[PDB]
Design a protein around this ligand. Structure first.
Ligand SMILES: Cn1cc(N)c(C(=O)NC2CCC2)n1
Ligand SMILES: [Zn+2]
Length: 140
């Protein structure tokens, strides 16, 4: 589990979105495993605006933050998961590291702020759904 809280927006894995998230929907994309809902209170997180390929992610299944190198966001075949079938996921960044399904929502962060959230795992890789292209998260 986990979310990004930026202004009056809550960014979560689409597959972990609650009824309240869907009832307060701003934007969603199945291909990116992302959903954004509205919040009453303003949020503590800042979104990176950058093309960093190094950062740190939070891994709940280890209670640890790990520094990683990661690929630029791309369209990638992902094998079947407990919450999704084998499919292509877009805006996906991969790093060598530990990921289990419940790690989804862990933040990846660079010097510029929040890069993305844990979305995929298996075969020694961790995949992150990029948010840095979502410029509209910064306003309105
Ligand atoms: C976040 N996420 C989605 C997954 N499917 C996995 C995953 O397959 N985890 C295993 C543990 C050895 C890789 N992790
Ligand atoms: Zn950065």
């Amino acid at each position: 589990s986990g979310a990004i809280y930026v202004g009056n927006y809550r960014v979560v894995n689409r597959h972990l979105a609650t009824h309240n998230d869907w009832a307060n929907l701003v934007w969603e994309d199945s291909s990116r495993d992302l959903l954004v809902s509205s919040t009453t209170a303003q949020g503590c997180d800042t979104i990176a605006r950058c093309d960093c390929q190094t950062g740190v992610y939070y891994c709940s299944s280890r209670r640890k933050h790990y520094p990683v190198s990661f690929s630029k966001p791309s369209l990638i075949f992902v094998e079947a998961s407990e919450y999704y079938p084998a499919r292509y996921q877009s805006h996906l960044m991969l790093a060598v590291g530990h990921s289990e399904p419940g790690d989804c929502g862990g933040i990846l962060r660079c010097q510029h702020g929040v890069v993305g959230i844990v979305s995929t795992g298996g075969n020694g890789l961790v995949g992150f759904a990029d948010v840095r292209d979502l410029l509209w998260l910064d306003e309105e």
